[PDB]
């Protein structure tokens, strides 16, 4: 089993019995991945316990697996762990079930819908400003994640279900999904357990989170079913009259999670950058003022007008792609771009690493929004820079997240400035676990303008 990459003649760190190359995750697997890239070059193999994982870095090879051979050979992400009813969630579902869930849910994020979520969020901008304006008094540090997390929550519920639960006025989901903890280490390493827990009804999500979201999303549901907008919660009612009940809740939980957790983490990273780069912060405050004269209310079209904003957002995502790695399980023997990949292998694209490769980026540790200007934008390979994945299985929420973040940014910057305080971590360190987090909360002071 551990003979695979020696047999295919693919380079790699030497696996230990049982553990595989697991111990190398000790100092976080963005580092492991960087090390590997440097040490082995363009393609390598390692073992999550007994699982062979082939890393590929060739822009062409990546396009083939992400785009060309998706439907046929590379359709599914890793077999994750013990999901429960979340088996149905779109990001977890495989093969046919996924295709069906995809075109069922993909119309959720069209122009018209998006355009129709600009006024809905437009009330949450007004409550985010107000929250911060109150927090500008004390003049002490601040936790961006906490104030930003509640914004995300509010936007997600109100659009996807059209349910205002006014989170911004009420100070589960963060307790949802540990590497050091024997847990994922006993599964990421050891998968043979999984079918057991599926009978034990044990879940990667605590029973109490999903039970809440269960009866809660069952409640946002009831209200609709009698009283007489074509939205997310509405779209899934369409299919029920070939969708089902727990399949409806499943999609909801992923969406609530995605929209809450990622949106706020990214927004924290951007603010961190704008403080630690005030010139960039000013240039943006300028653009915002140029497009929106007089602290005016952002809009769908005025949002797309802002080039430098988009450049800022893109460059944060170069440094801090919250996914680390894209993955695709190889479901039949295959030969892509002159390389043989056997059925069963997990093909891995090390996004964080390629986003930092001395090859495609000069000065790759530095935050340089300009590397994204219309002048330079075309020298950038859509297959080295993939914060949203690519091909059919790419991020369905991309356009919502970008607009939502930007709406959060426009309004916040047309009202406030951001500066490091003494409880700001300069520079920033990543925590070692799964998705990209800062090892200490991002904390910054906030002047009124
Ligand atoms: C800045 C915030 C976000 C980032 C950086 C982001 C990034 C990604 C990435 C890299 C993937 C995998 C694509 C692939 O493997 O090719 C992904 C998948 C997905 N994302 Fe997004 N995402 C973000 C926000 C969202 C939002 C707001 C939603 C919807 C509410 C969303 C829903 C999904 C779903 C359902 C999948 C799995 C797609 C499928 O298999 O059909 N994520 N996300
Ligand atoms: C490598 C094994 C690891 C356990 C794994 O497969 N998970 C990651 C992380 C996936 C987690 C899974 C999850 C956590 C908590 C609740 C539900 C599911 N994140 C996830 O699917 O979030 C939805 C998102 C969409 N866009 C960004 S996050 C792979 C992945 C899937 C989808 C998008 C990006 C990366």
**If you write DSSP's letter for every residue of 244-260 in order, what string do you get?**
-HHHHHHHHHHHHHHHH
Name beta bridge partners: 143. Answer: 443
Q: Hey, which of 76, 149, 236, 397 would you mutate to test ligand 1's pocket, going by the most ligand atoms within 8 Å of its Cβ?
A: 397
The vertex-176 CA angle with 393 and 328, nearest 5°, equals 25
Atom 15 of ligand 2: nearest residue by CA position: 177
The binding-site residues of ligand 1, defined as CB within 6 angstroms of any ligand atom, are: 90-91, 102, 254-255, 258-259, 262-263, 266, 322-323, 326, 387-390, 393-397, 400-401
From the CA of 324, give the closest atom in ligand 2.
Answer: 35
Q: How was this structure determined?
A: X-ray
CA pair distance 210, 324, nearest whole angstrom: 26
- Which residue intervals of 190-231 are DSSP H helices? 194-200, 207-224
Domain containing 266 equals 1-449
CA angle 284, 290, 291 (to 5 degrees): 95
The number of distinct structural domains making up the chain is: 1
Contact (CB, 8 A) for 272 and 427: no
8 A C-beta contact, residue 292 and residue 122:
no
For the chain, the residue count is: 449
Residue 144 and residue 425 in contact, taking contact as beta carbons nearer than 8 Å: no
Atom of ligand 2 nearest to the CA of 401: 26
Contact by Cβ (8 Å): 432, 27? yes
Radius of gyration of the chain (CA): 22
Q: How far is the CA of 73 from the centre of ligand 2 (A)?
A: 21
Residues 153 and 213 sit within 8 Å (Cβ to Cβ): no
CA–CA dist 331, 69 (Å, integer): 11
3-state secondary structure of 407: helix
Torsion angle of the four alpha carbons 280, 283, 289, 292, in this order, in degrees rounded to the nearest 10: -70
Among all bound ligands, the one having the nearest atom to the CA of 213 is 2
Q: How far is the CA of 148 from the centre of ligand 2 (A)?
A: 20
Per-residue burial over 26-39, b = 16 or more CB atoms within 10 Å of its CB, e = otherwise: eebbbbbbbebbee
395 is known to lie in a ligand binding site:
yes
Q: Which residues contact 446 (CB under 8 A, 6 or more apart)?
A: 132, 135, 136, 142, 416, 417, 418
CATH number, residue 42: 1.10.630.10
Sign of the dihedral defined by the CA atoms of residues 371, 372, 374, 379, in that order: positive
Nearest-angstrom CA–CA distance, 326 and 241 = 35
Mutate-to-test residue for ligand 2 from 46, 48, 49, 77, highest number of ligand atoms within 8 A of CB: 77
* Strands of the sheet with 346-349, listed across from one edge: 43-48, 51-56, 346-349, 326-329
Q: Ligand 1: distance of its center to the CA of 255 in Å?
A: 9
Tokens 């930003």 identify what position?
148
Name which of 11, 57, 60 is nearest 34 in CA terms: 57
């Amino acid at each position: 089993s551990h003979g695979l990459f020696k047999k295919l003649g693919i380079p790699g760190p030497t696996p230990l019995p049982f553990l595989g190359n697991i111990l190398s995750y000790h100092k976080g697997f963005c580092m492991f991945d960087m090390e590997c890239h440097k040490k082995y070059g363009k393609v390598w193999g390692f073992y999550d316990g007994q699982q062979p994982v082939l890393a590929i870095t060739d822009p062409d090879m990546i396009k083939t697996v992400l785009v060309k051979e998706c439907y046929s050979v590379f359709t599914n992400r890793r077999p994750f762990g013990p999901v429960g009813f979340m088996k149905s969630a779109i990001s977890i579902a495989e093969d046919e079930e996924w295709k069906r869930l995809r075109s069922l849910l993909s119309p959720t994020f069209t122009s018209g819908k998006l355009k129709e979520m600009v006024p809905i969020i437009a009330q949450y901008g007004d409550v985010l400003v107000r929250n911060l304006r109150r927090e500008a008094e004390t003049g002490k540090p601040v936790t961006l994640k906490d104030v930003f997390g509640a914004y995300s929550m509010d936007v997600i519920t109100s659009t996807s279900f059209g349910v205002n639960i006014d989170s911004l006025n009420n100070p589960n989901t963060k307790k949802l999904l540990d590497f050091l903890d024997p847990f994922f280490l006993s599964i990421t390493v050891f998968p043979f357990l999984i079918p057991i827990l599926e009978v034990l009804n044990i879940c990667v999500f605590p029973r109490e989170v999903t039970n809440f979201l269960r009866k809660s999303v069952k409640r946002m549901k009831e209200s609709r079913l009698e009283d007489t907008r074509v939205d997310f919660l509405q779209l899934m009612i369409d299919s029920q009259n070939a969708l089902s009940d727990l399949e409806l809740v499943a999609q909801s939980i992923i969406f609530i999670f995605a929209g809450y957790e990622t949106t706020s983490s990214v927004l924290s990273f951007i603010m961190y950058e704008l403080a630690t780069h005030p010139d960039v912060q000013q240039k943006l405050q300028e653009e915002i003022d140029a497009v929106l004269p007089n602290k005016a209310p952002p809009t769908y079209d005025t949002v797309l007008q802002m080039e430098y904003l988009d450049m800022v957002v893109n460059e944060t995502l170069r440094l801090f792609p919250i996914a680390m790695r894209l993955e695709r399980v190889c479901k039949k023997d295959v030969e892509i771009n002159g390389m043989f990949i056997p059925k069963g292998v997990v093909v891995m694209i090390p996004s964080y690493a390629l986003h930092r490769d001395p090859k495609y980026w000069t000065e790759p540790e530095k935050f340089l929004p300009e590397r994204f200007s219309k002048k330079n934008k075309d020298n950038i390979d859509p297959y080295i820079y993939t914060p949203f994945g690519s091909g059919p299985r790419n991020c369905i929420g991309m356009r919502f997240a970008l607009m939502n973040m930007k709406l959060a940014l426009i309004r916040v910057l047309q009202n406030f400035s951001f500066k490091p305080c003494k409880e700001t971590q300069i520079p920033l360190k990543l925590s070692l676990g799964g998705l990209l987090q800062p090892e200490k909360p991002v904390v910054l002071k906030v002047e009124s303008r």
